[PDB]
Design a protein around this ligand. Structure first.
Ligand SMILES: C[S@@+](CC[C@H](N)C(=O)[O-])C[C@H]1O[C@@H](n2cnc3c(N)ncnc32)[C@H](O)[C@@H]1O
Length: 371
């Protein structure tokens, strides 16, 4: 896709209306959300959707109930807003307690057990006594385990729709919700001779340890540019996460801007910067959406997202490369790290004209220079 195509919001028809989608936004052609859309019915007056994506799953409630939506993805919030659907940039556990009659939760299984648990408890806390939860998921991705936990938190629960491995259950709050679990985790790492303490919320990439690919990128970067090669330079970190690249580059004296689509990750980066007495801009952004049109950089770095066991480069990851080429000044440089067999080489050749391979073992570090 072109940059404009990546960032474009496209409305698709459904009976009575339209819904905006875009590349990089969850909840489109997603069987879990599709099953919710076929199943959810109004109950009471106030509903809360804790993982809406583009908003298809809970859409049947719109215009029949008051619906609030809490969403961590900037890309998804762009879509919801374009669709005229009320939505807030918010973590699931930021939901008001005891304020809702109905909650809708497509299980965020891809973000892991702790994130799902925090979402389940947030759902339980959000409901008034006697309120109900629509819980949807995939038996291949923890549905039975998470449904069992929801039943323990809430009370009576029953499957109300099934299609292949996909499930929607309906549950009733019959008991008091517990307190939120502890959400913050910290760990310390020595990177290129300096000590860092990273801080993060549930669901982030590489919780609890610095990703070996990210370390490899930093090693290749310091080898290529020197320990002083980053000082005073403007750096863009595409997909900054909790700051595995951002913090060291800041410490090395770069002027760093991190862009990150996931709110939980943005807050994680902010806490790490503070705890380590480092300054950088930690932006909640769908790729470079938060940047001015004119912003350019001397160095761009990325450990892009990837589909686990996938063989195909993700739309977001392809956009990272396109944006990198467009956002570099003449003579600026790009570092990208990936799994060894992802086909980034032709993409770099197309957007930059040439590329180099700085490292290749467990991961490959690719390099390109803006002409
Ligand atoms: C492989 S992780 C790397 C995180 C961090 N830079 C590191 O090296 O540990 C890729 C990051 O890209 C982020 N991401 C996914 N889609 C994005 C998008 N549309 N815009 C910006 N960041 C995105 C993810 O949430 C994740 O934090």
């Amino acid at each position: 896709l072109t940059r404009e195509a990546y960032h474009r919001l496209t409305p698709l028809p459904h009976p009575g209306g339209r819904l905006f989608i875009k590349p990089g936004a969850r909840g489109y052609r997603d069987p879990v959300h599709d099953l919710l859309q076929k199943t959810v019915e109004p109950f009471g007056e106030r509903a809360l959707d804790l993982n809406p994506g583009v908003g298809w799953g809970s859409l049947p409630l719109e215009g029949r109930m008051a619906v609030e939506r809490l969403e961590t993805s900037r890309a998804a919030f762009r879509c919801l807003t374009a669709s005229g659907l009320q939505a807030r940039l918010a973590l699931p556990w930021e939901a008001a307690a005891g304020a809702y009659d109905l909650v809708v939760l497509a299980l965020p299984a891809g973000r892991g057990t702790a994130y799902v648990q925090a979402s389940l408890v947030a759902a339980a806390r959000a409901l008034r006594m006697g309120g109900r939860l629509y819980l949807a998921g995939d038996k291949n991705k923890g549905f039975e385990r998470y449904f069992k936990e929801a039943r323990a938190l809430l009370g009576y629960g029953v499957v109300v729709r099934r299609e292949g491995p996909y499930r929607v259950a309906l549950l009733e709050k019959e008991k008091e919700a517990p307190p939120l679990p502890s959400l913050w985790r910290a760990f310390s790492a020595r990177i290129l001779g300096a000590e860092y303490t990273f801080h993060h919320l549930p669901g982030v990439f590489s919780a609890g340890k610095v990703d070996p690919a990210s370390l490899l990128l930093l090693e290749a970067l310091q080898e290529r540019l020197g320990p002083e090669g980053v000082r005073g330079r403007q750096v863009l970190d595409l997909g900054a996460g909790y700051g595995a690249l951002t913090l060291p580059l800041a410490r090395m004296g770069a002027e760093v801007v991190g862009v990150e689509d996931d709110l939980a990750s943005v807050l994680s980066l902010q806490k790490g910067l503070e705890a380590n007495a480092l300054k950088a801009q930690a932006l909640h952004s769908d790729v470079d959406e938060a940047l001015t049109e004119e912003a350019r950089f001397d160095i761009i770095v990325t450990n892009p997202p990837f589909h686990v066991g996938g063989a195909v480069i993700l739309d977001v990851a392809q956009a990272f490369v396109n944006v990198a080429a467009a956002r570099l000044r003449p003579g600026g440089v790009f570092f990208l790290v990936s799994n060894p067999f992802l086909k980034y080489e032709p993409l770099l050749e197309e957007k930059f004209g040439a590329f180099q391979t700085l490292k290749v073992a467990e991961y490959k570090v690719l390099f390109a220079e803006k002409r």
